[PDB]
Amino acid sequence: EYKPRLLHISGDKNAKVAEVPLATSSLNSGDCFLLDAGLTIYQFNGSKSSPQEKNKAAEVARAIDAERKGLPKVEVFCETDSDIPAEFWKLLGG
């Protein structure tokens, strides 16, 4: 099947970000997250925490931005409510 990627951007006051395997349930709503799917990519940023993961994340998305040359499509949002749109959760969870 396609090659999905689960990146995580968060760490309460001790922010930390790094690669991660699939995880729809073990996800982390509230901090900024990034899933990579073939050409599309959803930075499911989480509003319960904006500055830590927004910095560490914007850092990660920037590097991926220069690596793929923007060829792929991205979707970024650090939201909490409605944080589970069947489309993204169907992608990595379904």
**Is 91 marked within a binding site?**
no
Give the whole-angstrom CA distance, residue 7 versus residue 19: 4
Residue 94 DSSP label: -
Solving technique for this entry? Answer: NMR
* β-bridge mates for residue 32, sequence order: 9
Domain holding 2, by residue range, is 1-94
Closest-CA residue to 75 (of 27, 22, 35): 35
**Is 10 marked within a binding site?**
yes
**Is 9 marked within a binding site?**
yes
Give the whole-angstrom CA distance, residue 53 versus residue 71: 24
**Is 65 marked within a binding site?**
no
H helices of 47-90, in order, are 51-68, 86-88
Q: Any idea what the CATH number is for the domain that residue 15 is in?
A: 3.40.20.10
Residue 81 DSSP label: T
Contacts of 82 (CB under 8 A, 6+ apart): none
**Is 49 marked within a binding site?**
no
**Is 27 marked within a binding site?**
no
Q: What share of the chain is helix, strand, coil (3-state, %, to 5)?
A: 30, 30, 40
Give the whole-angstrom CA distance, residue 12 versus residue 52: 7
Overall domain count for the chain: 1
**Is 62 marked within a binding site?**
no
Terminal CA-to-CA distance of the chain, rounded, Å? 12
